């Protein structure tokens, strides 16, 4: 009847014989083990090697498989996604469903994973009590057999499915058979922007409970007005025979100290005309001066729930970590423990580049440490309930969590087609209700979300109200249908901009500042997604944070997103490389759109991460005279692990330094008086840099961790000294093809046909491989490209505007190339025009002044046609012959920075290996720029001025033409791009132009000057 | 010491080119030994009788942002009309120029002065590409005012009726001019984007006889 009923094509059937959802159980039989959270003998892991066979459809599965193992089957580690073992291909699609949209039907070609395990069950487990199997995650639907007999069925890939195996098991060897379907009616609610995989991808376990058992428990904490008193309220439910001798004790522990305890017989208070719950009890424990839980200080207690006899014989104990905190919205503010939160959040998918969607403790811990080290205090479970250990870790390390139901129907037309249909209400309700039932005791969870990108439908309103009814302790949010519907307590837009309105029909994305004050609007605003970190991105990040700090009701947001969803593939030589959409033969696909992370898939930081860390700092600084004002943005903690290091340097040369301990109350200020700084004799700009250092290691950081920094310009002494007059005079030599200039062992050649410096010699060794030429383009960033495709052009995208205007095709036409001998110099004057189909795009006018000292001063004046799309850059480029080990510069660094993403960068003297001057974005683009640079050193060369630059072994052309970083080849010599001006990178989103007006090169006329010499 | 600053010559050189004479100058404006501004200029006079002036200015980051970055001179000529291609016809400043239209404007000299009862900098026109006065034409991309009153006299005179026309005509040509503000008139009100804070500034002018 299994293949006959086709339950995987029925949204009315989401499970068969599945047990009720509940908070994490271990059925300890010793209270001390429960208290200490030590392993339980009643909870066994089936995370071992299983037998696995792949099939094209469920109809192709042989009957024998239920009884006997298949010889064709392989031995695979479980948990796993079977795509990660190569059994079929992972599919990366964003919005469009990976299957034909024909609800509730799925393709007849439905990849089917047949898992089986032969395992021992001890007789003790079967003599008494209840043995259940727990599948924490099966994607996307499954049938279960035990010793050849059908047990049941489950859907929803992201919550545990549990079955009673008591009547199916025998002493000794048993066999489980699990038939996992890739596609089901459940898939229509699982259209998240991520890799589409399948299998038993989370833990499998066996749990033994007594016949009379704790079946559910809820913990609540309520407070008086100043949080100096709390009542812990614990509702406990039992299953089994009701008896007068039964008791529940809830005891609360702080370390080895019991702080409160309550004992009661079963039998709740009367609730209606038919009485009360005889099988329930509510315990109420008083806690004086409770230690409060927050992301700042994750104070936890241990609650132990003992089911026992009046006489004190233990039946079983369950337990959980308890965080005393209150979450509420009052007067339009989200408050934690009475204080308004500022969410430094990030969206995080469950992704590993080797194991796919299987999560391990090591990776989770790595993520949490990196998050907190980079000033994040919050995470959104985008877009499904996570591995249960995640919440425990967030409880303990201290991160605010948005727990989000596994519901996304992005691909529907319109988006609410299913969520407004009462026939899909049952499937939806289960994804919401079973999440709440599982995770409601975790203090880290502060907000419930109804899912993602599923429009707004009546089913959302019903489930919003359900959650508010069952759990008034947490706000409910949901972004669908315009981010401010009746199904959300928080205005939670995705990619709403700071100042710019995007007035889309029906679902406008208002400026976040404007949104708050719309007539009648009073709710807090926290972006569920913002600052799309796709490739070279996070331009304008500082603008969000300025607004967040200025506006009380702008309470932050969650960056999209934490980690690149790249997957490891291997080339012919067995060398690993990062793959994205389409690289597995998957079609249709959405290519590199799966990589939007602040970190690479292996958790190496993108440069954007430092910009996030800096903008998310918890200490704010102001300078007035010799006084530094430090303001704390902590709501609860004092700065008891913080010292301020200050340093004053003249053009990167240290002059003075010192350290002052921080003693700042939460929300408080401290004044730090800098000592009198000695005047520098020499010219240059004095810079003050401050850093907040954590002297002591924490659970999340090492000793000496830097949590915050800031810089100011102090006194500047402009150089008024005349350079010592030169003895020699450069000699100009002329032919029809060249102007040549000689001075000692130095020669410059200007080609008279092209009008560019074509060559430069030191001694007699050539310095250039390609001439020094103007450049007005960049290898397009993901933000420049957007959603444009070779087949379907998006004419609005920056890359398409530049292409249509002929920016990449434009050839330099020489207008003027003259040479003049001066008293102590040779002067070369050039003029060029870049034209496309009779339209002049740019005019570049230059002077090159080569004096007796050997220095070449280059003056560049560029005109940009007002009606051409604003160019990506205004600069020069050349391929240098030299490949040197180090790059040394006085400017912003040490990391990659761009005009709209440079606040985190510091002005100083930086020295890095050449490789560090290249950012290995998986999709190659313009990268490695450093801005605000006054001096650049490379081999024998020095450039001085006020410029942006990048330097690498890859030309803009190669970066432009190559789709994957692993296919890039180091070119001969070094490509240098020196820009007077560079366009913003944007990133508010990555599917429409997002570079703010102030970062577009729209001035029409541009001027810059460089000095090139040998040191 | 902005009002008191004296120019100190750092460099003044002259060069002959194939078809032009090139004059290069550098000045430091200082007060009590502190350098406030450095101005580096080239003047290029060619066979057409056009003088191309390039001006590159450094402003010390720790000096208050200056009110303007420009040139001035008292012209000998007093002419009746002022003709310009730029924003007008009325007085306009960088933070008050939205009402002004780009066109060819022609006004009597008196209209180029705004008779504020308390005298101050006045009559600026922004976004000007060409200016004509008597025998002179200036081209570039500049802001200008032109009147019979020096900045010194306007600064020293509390009432408009006490102003006297000076000999010739005072010309101020600015590459850059600070906002005028006005959110209120008792605290600084010039918005950051209209303060001359960039540190380094470039403009260029062509002066010829037309
Ligand atoms: Mg079904
Ligand atoms: Mg989506
Ligand atoms: Mg800063
Ligand atoms: Mg206008
Ligand atoms: Na705020
Ligand atoms: Na994406
Ligand atoms: Na401290
Ligand atoms: Na590329
Ligand atoms: Na006055």
XYZ file of C-alpha atoms and ligand atoms in Angstrom, chain A residues 639-643 661-662, ligand 7:
8
model
C 34.176 46.862 30.335
C 35.985 44.503 32.737
C 38.132 42.785 30.079
C 39.199 45.830 28.076
C 42.144 48.179 27.796
C 42.262 50.466 31.231
C 38.629 50.857 30.205
Na 39.045 46.731 31.961
